Amino acid sequence: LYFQGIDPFTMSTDKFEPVPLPEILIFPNRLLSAETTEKLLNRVYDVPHVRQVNISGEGVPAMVGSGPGKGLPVEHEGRKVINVKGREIELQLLVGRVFVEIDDIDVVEKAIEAIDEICQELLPFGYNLEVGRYSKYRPT
């Protein structure tokens, strides 16, 4: 079937305006240490067409299921400082998500292959990569 409608992810509608820049999303199978985060961000910023890299800790801590502290959250991690392309970044939490903004939809495929090669080396415990494409709600 040859589509004849309008997709709000790729064209303006009366309710949506496409966000030009996609994300490459990294979902590691284990949280990232400060050191891993530092190496990952430095390497990813060297990939052509990467505009910015953002990170997040988890919203909800890990709960202790056995031993001392059972039933309670793990002890909160300590603050760490990393150096990304000469800028100091303070980490309050182990990193569970990475968001990589790419400067053009057309180069996503190449960018994600490059990022995949980095992750193969740095995230031996496994990970998943996704492309996110967005549209802004702008009614009327």
Place this chain on the structure above:
Amino acid sequence: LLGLDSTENLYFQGIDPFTMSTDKFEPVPLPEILIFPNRLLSAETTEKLLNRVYDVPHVRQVNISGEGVPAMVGSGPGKGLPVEHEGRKVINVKGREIELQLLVGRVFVEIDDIDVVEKAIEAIDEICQELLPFGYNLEVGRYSKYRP
């Protein structure tokens, strides 16, 4: 040879190119509505927002991202002083007690079907108008898994 170029710009109009590489990318059926508050949310506002969002029809799951907060703080010669509850806050969402450890900057609301997103985003917009007076932006996201 203007005039005799190939016509992929017409044939593929409105399609994102990477999506045609089905050897490498698998479409994710379920979209998300994203809430981007203009300020990082307090635990109190996060709690209110999550309670209301979980009542919107067709919401499947809700995730959050944002900025961590220290569990130790100090301005003296010694080590940091520990913050009560390790700096985290307990919130109550639909009867569940949840330890929150982010100032929230992005809410990810998974919707069960692209076809119901319009009505869902209208309900979420009404919530945000009420709960986020400092302003916010809403977006929809569609995902593709890289599976080379």
